[PDB]
């Protein structure tokens, strides 16, 4: 029975490939040959943040584009005032090995997690004035890789147990568990409408999930190695992914296939993070080579390079208003570019 | 805008308080050494933790040696795919790799050798020294002293290996036991020495699960690692 099941799966995968190929009437590269290229843009470090002791792994911009939170594996979670470089809070973490952080859309809560397999929610506006642990989520069986807030009461989490889950903060129980990924889930991105999200799970594939229906809608398998970064296109109809193969790929949720691949001859290192600008024309990706490249989403060329760091780039996030982009690195320093 | 200046002053006061707190945190942090405990589940690593102490994804054991703070992390409740979460420990002082020597018939010794090679040759772990604990020495001694488990059946190079002249055996061990012990030690070493970079070093140690010297051994390896790093910084080594 197993052989017949595998044969049926292979035949239906071949049917999927044939259907996808039939829709490949033309390539995005050919269509975008006419548009004016961005040329060259040279960003400069406008602010430098210092105070973290160990390597910084993750950060998140606020919805107001003023406050941001960054997580360092020394056990400290710090909230920064982007405009004035001041520090608003310095939350001490129970577990030093924090691997993710998140900022609530309303900003009333901050979440983080790591190798402890527990996601802790911190309340920033307690009447006492001090930061306190509001809720602890301990249903996962692996390190927390990523987490993002849907609202003040709903948070989606990524774990190394190969399954994603939706958590009801007030109840503290998993409302829905997403399964189907083979490898460790690394990055999580919520769609602009908050109804869909995508993630790569170290199996060279990206899965599209429905937050309410609790099932996988589409699967993309254009990558060759583990996927470390994922981010939606600003319109929500496409998303870009970063993988260890040193190539970034853009997928469209309606075409159901890769549109183009971003790569170059002399880059042989994996991508750690990826993000889009407000217009979506600029794709910013962090690399293990201590610098971040800027790619033209349409013309498939490098528009600029950010080389303010001297260690591995761990995180990269653009402001909601698109005014500036902040990048973190293992050197324990954050550079804000504009 | 007097309110703006007032809130700016309040923010500066909060920043000063946070700076003082972070300075204290930095002072305490730099004085503490972090260690990673690794090895197969069948190994005696669990007994070592219990001796030194005398569902979470990681366990922390804190002990003081000569009034020196050491933090040890045991990665439990984690999947066997170590290639991702292992990168987090790229800044640890040393990695305590515990391998049971008496594990040759799955051939757990070969798996341990491959894992050690992977950690040593990893891109991000090249800056971390590895403390190699060769555990279960009594089991190996009783297995090789009289038994049918031939080492050459699983390691054919053993038949043409002789104990090095620069070896110090404990008074009373049979020459065959010492030969097997040093063969395993050199098999582990040949992976590390092959790098030739000198950025990190391996410190093999014949160990028993009940040995109380393990704490002293770890202290000595930490001292040696720090001294070698400082000497290489000063171009002495």
């Amino acid at each position: 029975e197993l052989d017949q099941l595998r044969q049926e799966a292979e035949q239906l995968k071949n049917q999927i490939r044939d259907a996808r190929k039939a829709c490949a009437d033309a390539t995005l590269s050919q269509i975008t040959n006419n548009i004016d290229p961005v040329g060259r843009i040279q960003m400069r470090t406008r602010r430098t943040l210092r105070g973290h002791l160990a390597k910084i792994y993750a950060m998140h911009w606020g919805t107001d584009s003023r406050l941001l939170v960054s997580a360092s594996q020394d056990g400290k979670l710090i909230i920064w005032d982007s405009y004035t470089t001041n520090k608003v809070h310095a939350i001490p973490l129970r577990s030093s090995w924090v691997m993710t952080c998140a900022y609530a859309p309303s900003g009333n809560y901050v979440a983080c997690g790591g190798l402890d397999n527990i996601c802790s929610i911190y309340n920033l506006k307690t009447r006492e004035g001090n930061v306190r642990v509001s809720r602890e989520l301990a249903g996962h069986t692996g390190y927390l890789s990523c987490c993002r807030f849907l609202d003040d009461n709903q948070i989606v989490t990524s774990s190394g147990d190969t399954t994603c889950a939706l958590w009801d903060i007030e109840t503290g129980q998993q409302t829905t568990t997403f399964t189907g990924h083979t490898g460790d889930v690394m990055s999580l991105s919520l769609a602009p409408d908050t109804r869909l999200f995508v993630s790569g799970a170290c199996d060279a594939s990206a899965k599209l999930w429905d937050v309410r229906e609790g099932m996988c809608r589409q699967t993309f398998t254009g990558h060759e190695s583990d996927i470390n970064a994922i981010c939606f296109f600003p319109n929500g109809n496409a998303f870009a992914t970063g993988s260890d193969d040193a190539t970034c790929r853009l997928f469209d949720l309606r075409a159901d296939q890769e549109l183009m691949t971003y790569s170059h001859d002399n880059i042989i290192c994996g991508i750690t993070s990826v993000s889009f600008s407000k217009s979506g024309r600029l794709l910013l990706a962090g690399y293990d080579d201590f610098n971040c490249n800027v790619w033209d989403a349409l013309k498939a060329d490098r528009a600029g390079v950010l080389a303010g760091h001297d260690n591995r780039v761990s995180c990269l996030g653009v402001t909601d208003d698109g005014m500036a982009v902040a990048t973190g690195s293992w050197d324990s320093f954050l550079k804000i570019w504009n | 805008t007097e309110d703006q200046r007032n809130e700016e002053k309040a923010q500066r006061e909060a920043n000063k308080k946070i700076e003082k707190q972070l300075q204290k945190d930095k002072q305490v942090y730099r004085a503490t050494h972090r260690l990673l405990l690794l090895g197969a589940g069948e190994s005696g690593k669990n007994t070592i933790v219990k001796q030194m102490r005398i569902t979470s994804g990681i366990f922390e054991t804190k002990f003081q040696v000569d009034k020196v703070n050491f933090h040890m992390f045991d990665v439990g409740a984690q999947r066997d795919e170590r290639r991702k979460w292992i990168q987090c420990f790229n800044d640890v002082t040393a990695i305590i790799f515990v391998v049971a020597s008496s594990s040759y018939n799955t051939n757990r010794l070969q798996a341990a050798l491959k894992l050690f090679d992977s950690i040593w040759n990893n891109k991000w772990l090249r800056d971390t020294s590895v403390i190699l604990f060769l555990n279960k020495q009594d089991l190996l001694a009783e297995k090789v002293l009289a038994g049918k488990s031939k080492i050459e059946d699983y390691f054919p190079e053993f038949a043409r290996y002789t104990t090095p002249e620069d070896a110090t055996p404990e008074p009373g061990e049979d020459p065959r036991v010492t030969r097997a012990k040093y063969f395993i030690r050199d098999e582990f070493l040949r992976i590390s020495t092959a790098s030739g970079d000198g950025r990190h070093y391996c410190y093999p140690h014949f160990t028993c699960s009940v040995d109380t010297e393990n704490i002293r051994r770890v202290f000595n390896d930490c001292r040696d690692i720090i001294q070698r790093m400082h000497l290489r910084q000063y171009e002495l080594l």
Partner: nanobody
Amino acid sequence: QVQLQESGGGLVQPGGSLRLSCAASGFTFSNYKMNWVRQAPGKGLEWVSDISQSGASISYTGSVKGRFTISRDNAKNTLYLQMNSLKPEDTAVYYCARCPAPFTRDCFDVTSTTYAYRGQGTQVTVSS
């Protein structure tokens, strides 16, 4: 999609020889290290032999050293494992596995849990 298709197997009398093959597609074959692993009935995964990108470096497990031969053909994205003088203990399902990253010799393809970059495997039986 990353696909690995092992071929060759069946039953062979002890002391014979067998040729295993591994078709590869969906990735740049030359940029990844490859190795062979096996799982005997009732036993866990075992590493057999590995080959570098260009093949200049080759290694075998002690119980297979000098007995089998691992070779790769980057021109047609195929990997081979020549086996001779087989013994009953060699009976096991042999999986053709590719460990994660290119341009790196660090390699973690012995994990017990389902590995995304290994093929279905082929059964090899050694009996009279």
